Design an enzyme around this catalytic site. Structure first.
Site, short mmCIF file in Angstrom:
data_model
loop_
_atom_site.label_atom_id
_atom_site.label_comp_id
_atom_site.label_asym_id
_atom_site.label_seq_id
_atom_site.Cartn_x
_atom_site.Cartn_y
_atom_site.Cartn_z
N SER B 48 0.79 -1.23 0.00
CA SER B 48 0.00 0.00 0.00
C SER B 48 0.83 1.28 0.00
O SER B 48 0.25 2.36 -0.18
CB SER B 48 -0.96 0.01 1.19
OG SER B 48 -2.15 -0.69 0.85
N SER B 96 -6.45 2.89 3.75
CA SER B 96 -5.68 2.04 2.84
C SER B 96 -6.58 1.09 2.05
O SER B 96 -6.39 -0.12 2.03
CB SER B 96 -4.60 1.27 3.60
OG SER B 96 -3.52 1.04 2.71
CL LIG Z 1 -3.27 -0.32 -2.85
#
Ligand SMILES: [Cl-]
Ligand SMILES: [Ca+2]
Ligand SMILES: [Ca+2]
Ligand SMILES: [Ca+2]
Ligand SMILES: [Cl-]
Ligand SMILES: [Cl-]
Ligand SMILES: [Cl-]
Lengths: 243, 243
Positions: B48, B96
């Site tokens: 992420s 996220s």
């Molecule tokens: Cl992502």
């Protein structure tokens, strides 16, 4: 714009031996709240809350190139220690460095300053007085609800300046951020003309809403300045806006 | 560019029965510091943390209009409850929300994604794999020092996208702010391919300097995810970067 009075907020003023007004605006619901409808509309000198429109105008006109440009200390030792050093836009907002902003105003000039404040419909749109101090001891006046209207336009990039200028000023207004909220805001302290008052204006960003706020309170000495934020945050907690 | 290894930071990892690297970069002095020179240069899947370049590209190409545009939930109930709702760029970064960014990547497309990562000099620039998951289980790799190199370009608005896109992404990276510092950063948790690692990358803004950081650590289970920030902050506090 439909308004509700909540007198129960006065407990936080009374417990700190103070008098003042807090104004809140729920953006999602287009509803306002205040402990004092009359004082919410009373117009005062903006003092350092004028750094918000001043920064916008200086950026839009290129008086300030960006938030990294360094404004050198002019050598004069003033009472507030943090003023006696070099600054950029971020730090000059953080430490409310009046001399840096008086320099901006002189470069902007009265004609462009007046045209911009009329375009913003800022307060009473009156810049009578010294070009480098009219927001401290001149003719400009703005109420707490008028601060809200101005701040909502800034939040939505709807003021008559570039989108970039508005983004930079909102960056420089950053005051607090955590996992629960973001506060963008500016303090002010009006002492030169009665009544002596302190300001805090800005907004609280949540995941799914924005709460605009504007408060002012009587400020006979500088020893109560922290109460501007304390009383506001206690109102926000009472209303469950922040934990 | 002049690097120094400080093995005394290993105590913060061992204290927490963990292993990893913290890399710090003093922007004023152009000096780097790390507890592990070798792991500082080890390349891993970004997971992420790839939301930072992905956001930049989506904004620059108009896939995302601004930070207010709402990305509707696709109605798939996923394991992380905060993902099962509508999001904008701010909340999708905060929580996220991978599926929102997978849709960004499909709309960007393979050709434009590869060209933009080359323009950013991002990691090994390799997007082998699925266009909507290569940063989770494809060929892209990036080291902690390479994360810092990329972040420094973003901080200075030097990436080959518009200034506006860079300003919006830096707004969306806002993690913490108080009277002492501002942290802009992004977490990551790579689990699809071994070894399982956690990331935290970003920077600390002070009045007169910027400290960039990138950390990763072994993360066999999700129970230690809070250590990503906690250990970095223990290092920042040891180095007197934050109070
Ligand atoms: Cl992502
Ligand atoms: Ca109270
Ligand atoms: Ca008017
Ligand atoms: Ca420790
Ligand atoms: Cl000022
Ligand atoms: Cl460069
Ligand atoms: Cl910001």
């Amino acid at each position: 714009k439909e308004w509700q009075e909540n007198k129960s907020w006065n407990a936080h003023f009374t417990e700190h031996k103070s008098q003042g007004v807090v104004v809140l605006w729920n953006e999602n619901k287009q509803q306002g709240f205040t402990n004092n409808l009359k004082r919410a509309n009373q117009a005062f000198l903006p003092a350092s809350t004028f750094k918000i429109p001043n920064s916008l105008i200086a950026l839009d006109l290129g008086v300030v190139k960006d938030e990294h440009q360094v404004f050198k200390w002019d050598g004069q030792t003033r009472d507030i220690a943090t003023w006696n050093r070099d600054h950029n836009l971020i730090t000059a907002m953080k430490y409310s460095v009046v001399p840096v902003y008086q320099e901006f105003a002189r470069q902007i000039g009265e004609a462009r300053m007046s045209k911009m404040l009329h375009a913003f419909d800022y307060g009473n749109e009156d810049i009578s007085g010294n070009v480098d101090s009219f927001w401290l001891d001149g003719g400009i006046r703005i109420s707490a609800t008028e601060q809200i209207s101005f701040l909502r336009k800034l939040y939505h990039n709807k003021l008559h300046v570039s989108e970039r200028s508005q983004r930079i000023v909102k960056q420089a207004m950053l005051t607090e951020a955590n996992g629960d909220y973001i506060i963008r805001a500016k303090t002010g302290y009006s002492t030169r003309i009665e009544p002596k008052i302190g300001w805090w204006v800005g907004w609280v960003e949540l995941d799914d809403n924005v709460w605009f706020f504007a408060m002012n309170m009587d400020m006979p000495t500088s020893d109560g300045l922290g109460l501007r934020q304390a009383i506001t945050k206690e109102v926000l907690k009472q209303e469950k806006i922040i934990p």
